[PDB]
Amino acid sequence: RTTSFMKVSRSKVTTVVATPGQGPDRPQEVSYTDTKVIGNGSFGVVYQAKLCDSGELVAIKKVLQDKRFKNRELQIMRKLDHCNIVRLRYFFYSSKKDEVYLNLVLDYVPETVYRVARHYSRAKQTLPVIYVKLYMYQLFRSLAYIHSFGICHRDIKPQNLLLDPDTAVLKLCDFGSAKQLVRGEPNVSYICSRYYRAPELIFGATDYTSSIDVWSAGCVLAELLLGQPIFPGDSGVDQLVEIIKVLGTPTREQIREMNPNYTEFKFPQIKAHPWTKVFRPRTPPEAIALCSRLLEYTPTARLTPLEACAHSFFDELRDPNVKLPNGRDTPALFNFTTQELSSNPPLATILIPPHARH
Amino acid sequence: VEPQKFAEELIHRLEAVQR
Ligand SMILES: Nc1ncnc2c1ncn2[C@@H]1O[C@H](COP(=O)(O)OP(=O)(O)O)[C@@H](O)[C@H]1O
Ligand SMILES: [Cl-]
Ligand SMILES: [Mg+2]
Ligand SMILES: [Mg+2]
């Protein structure tokens, strides 16, 4: 759930002095019109609007600045610059009475992985594998990027994966739970949303790593393959039972890796259900393989995001003759930076195909 | 939550899907 402990002119024009997301603080007057809510929650309100100068659509995430908790969302977003992470254009502050709200002006992205998957579900179809490949690959790229700065998202789930259906570009959003993890410094365990929470988090670990994002990603993958969440359940126990019912009871050593405080309890020994029986018979073997290397009890045994990008499941995306089903070409996929590849530079031989060099 | 309390519930639940 939670983390650790303006003038109006004439359509109707709202003018504010907003600070650009990148570079040194150099605030500039920003004007926008056609404001409407495209989302509302206990966190605040999300609006769509159109910038007066360029006519470009933006999202404005308005969040209350609660001083009772640690708010790293702005601090974290400002440092991020990646093609698979939603762009922070500007931010500004505005006035619950006697309260100050933070406004994040972001690029507007019309869909999410969640809404798109819901379409296939109610249509009783499955998302074509080509999209599963495209979306998951871009997700892993975004994870490789944030992890290289030591930043863990902590809330990976389909609702936080924005999509432009025309370009098939995925952008990771919502850094309201994100944090730079430091070994030796404890974290909040009640993080990550139900269905997507790593087993070590459910066992209440406070010393977890960025590999919790990888588990969440594995859940997204499985969900896209399956047509529904793989580990549903209201409570942690409910969720862990679903996990055990697939992976089998974790061994004492796997338990120790997750949370040593549970090593001495005598858990009934449930047999693993073969991944090939979990999914439909027409599921590609390499998708199953990838999934099993993501959804591991031992956090250190999980693939890193960069390793996941290099997995054989994404081999098709490296074929020069591939295209989107709508006729268009695939988005940028091989423009890796030195930062992105820092965890494992030799992987560039796989990640950057020969036809991508030119 | 208490590891003891969490484990008891989990053990109880795993016995039911096992039996
Ligand atoms: N840049 C954006 N463009 C379009 N819609 C967005 C954008 N950012 C967020 N949304 C929508 O509004 C919701 C806002 O939630 P989010 O930004 O993920 O943080 P929180 O979950 O803390 O409210 C998202 O689930 C998403 O569907
Ligand atoms: Cl069993
Ligand atoms: Mg969100
Ligand atoms: Mg949030």
Q: How far, in Å, CA of A341 to CA of A160, rounded?
A: 24
A236 contacts: CB under 8 Å, gap ≥ 6? A197, A202, B6
What residue has token string 């969490």?
B6
- Partner residue facing B17 (CB), from A262, A266, A270: A270
Q: How far is CA A173 from CA A99, A104, A168, in A?
A: 25, 12, 16
Residue A174 to residues A159, A216, A282, Cα–Cα distance (Å) = 9, 15, 34
Which residues in chain A touch residue B13, judged by CB atoms under 8 angstroms apart? 237, 241
| Chain B residue at shortest CA distance from A259 | B3
CATH code for the part of the protein at A31-110: 3.30.200.20
Select from A91, A88, A63 the least CA-distant residue to A171.
A88
Q: CB–CB of A145/A342 below 8 Å? A: no
Which of the ligands is closest to the CA of residue A71?
4
- At position A19, the amino acid (one-letter code) is T
The upper half-sphere exposure of residue A296, i.e. CA atoms within 13 Å in the direction of its Cβ, equals 17
A3 lines ligand 1 (CB under 6 A): no
DSSP class per residue in A158-192: GGGEEEETTTTEEEE---SS-EE--TTS---SS-S
Residue of chain B whose Cα is closest to the Cα of A243: B14
| CA separation for the pair A221, A319 (Å, rounded) | 21
Closest approach of chain B CAs to the CA of A151, in angstroms? 27
Long-range contacts of A224-230 (CB under 8 A, 24+ apart): A224/A113, A224/A117, A224/A127, A224/A132, A224/A135, A224/A136, A225/A126, A225/A132, A225/A279, A225/A280, A225/A283, A225/A287, A225/A291, A226/A278, A226/A279, A226/A280, A227/A117, A227/A120, A227/A121, A227/A126, A228/A121, A229/A195, A230/A195, A230/A278
| H or E element at residue A102 | strand A101-107
Tell me whether residues A237 and B3 touch, CB distance under 8 A: no
Query: Which candidate, A272, A276, A273, A299, places its Cα nearest to that of A225?
Result: A276
Question: CATH 1.10.510.10 spans which residues of chain A?
Answer: 111-356
Which technique was the structure solved with, according to the deposited record? Answer: X-ray
Residue A67 makes CB contacts below 8 A (sequence gap 6+) with: none
Residue A54 CB-density burial (10 A; 0-12 exposed, 13-18 middle, 19+ buried): exposed
Q: Where in chain A is the domain with CATH 3.30.200.20?
A: 31-110
Atom 19 in ligand 1: residue holding the nearest Cα: A174
Q: Which residues pair with A195 in a beta bridge?
A: none
Q: How far, in Å, are A177, A204, A234, A273 from residue A230 at the CA level?
A: 23, 21, 13, 13
Resolution in A: 2.1
Q: Which ligand is located closest to the Cα atom of residue A159? A: 1
Q: Ligand 1: which atom is nearest the Cα of residue A106?
A: 1
Active site residues per annotation of A: 155
Residue given tokens 């459910």 in the structure block: A202
Can you name the CATH fold of A111-356? Transferase(Phosphotransferase); domain 1 (1.10.510)
Contact A161, A168 (CB under 8 A): no
Query: Is any atom of ligand 1 closer than 6 Å to the C-beta of A173?
Result: yes
* Selection from A276, A240, A128, A155 nearest residue B9 by Cα: A240
Angle at A278 (CA atoms; ends A307, A158), nearest 5 degrees: 55
Of A137, A187, A144, A142, the residue nearest A160 (C-alpha): A142
Half-sphere exposure of A325 (CA within 13 A, CB side): 9
In A194-349 the beta strands, taken as DSSP E runs, fall at: none
- Taking the CA atoms of chain B, what radius of gyration do you get in angstroms? 9
Query: Residue A329 carries which DSSP code?
Result: P
- For A348, the 3-state DSSP assignment is helix
Position A106: which residue type? L
Amino acid at position A314, single letter: F
Q: How many angstroms from the chain centroid is the CA of residue A47?
A: 21
What lies within 8 Å, CB to CB, of A41 at 6+ separation is none
Beta strands A57-64; A101-107: pairing state? antiparallel
Alpha-carbon distance of A263 to A299, in angstroms, equals 16
- Say which residues have a Cβ less than 8 Å from residue A54's Cβ, sequence separation at least 6: none
